[PDB]
Amino acid sequence: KEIKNKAPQRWSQEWEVELGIKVMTKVIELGGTPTIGDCAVILRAAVRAPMPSAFLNILQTTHSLGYVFGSPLYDEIITLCLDLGELDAAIAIVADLETSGIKVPDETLDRVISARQSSD
Numbered sequence: 294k295e296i297k298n299k300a301p302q303r304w305s306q307e308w309e310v311e312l313g314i315k316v317m318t319k320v321i322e323l324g325g326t327p328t329i330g331d332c333a334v335i336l337r338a339a340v341r342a343p344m345p346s347a348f349l350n351i352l353q354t355t356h357s358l359g360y361v362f363g364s365p366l367y368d369e370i371i372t373l374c375l376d377l378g379e380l381d382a383a384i385a386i387v388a389d390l391e392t393s394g395i396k397v398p399d400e401t402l403d404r405v406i407s408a409r410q411s412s413d
Contacts, residue, residue, distance in 0.1 A: 306342035310335060314347060317354055329360045336362075340370060345379035349386060356393050368401045375404060380412050 302308075313335045317327055332355045339347045348370055355362065367390065374383035387405050390397055 306338060307344055310339050310342075310344055310347050310351075313338065314351060314354070321354070321357070326358060329355070329362075332360060333362070333366070336366065336370070340373055343377055345374050345377060345382045348374065348382060349389065352386070353389060356389075356395075361395055364396070364398050367395070368398050371397070371401050371405065375408050380408050384409065 317331075317335070320327055332351070335351055336348075336355075339351060352370075367386075371383050371386060374380075374386060383405055387397065387402060
């Protein structure tokens with residue numbers, strides 16, 4: 294009775310990436326392994342519309358299955374985090390990237406350190 298006459302909700306890329314990460318979490322819970330391409334696709338959806346908060350969780354989900362992206366993609370996401378003003382987000386990103394053991398570009402870490410020094 295309630296669903297049929299409810300007004301529809303317009304599309305938004307934020308709701309899109311939310312539904313995407315929820316679908317990914319459910320698929321992982323039910324025993325399914327998403328491909329690396331879908332991970333790159335949700336990363337592209339997250340970088341297209343400003344949403345820095347989702348970066349950490351999506352990259353953690355990617356690293357969970359064992360997938361590792363190239364250095365340019367991490368460079369791009371870190372540069373976007375620095376540009377849009379989410380310094381703590383980029384700090385968490387480089388922290389979990391160092392924890393995972395992947396190698397980030399030197400200029401990216403240098404820019405992160407410079408932004409951290411400027412913020413302090």
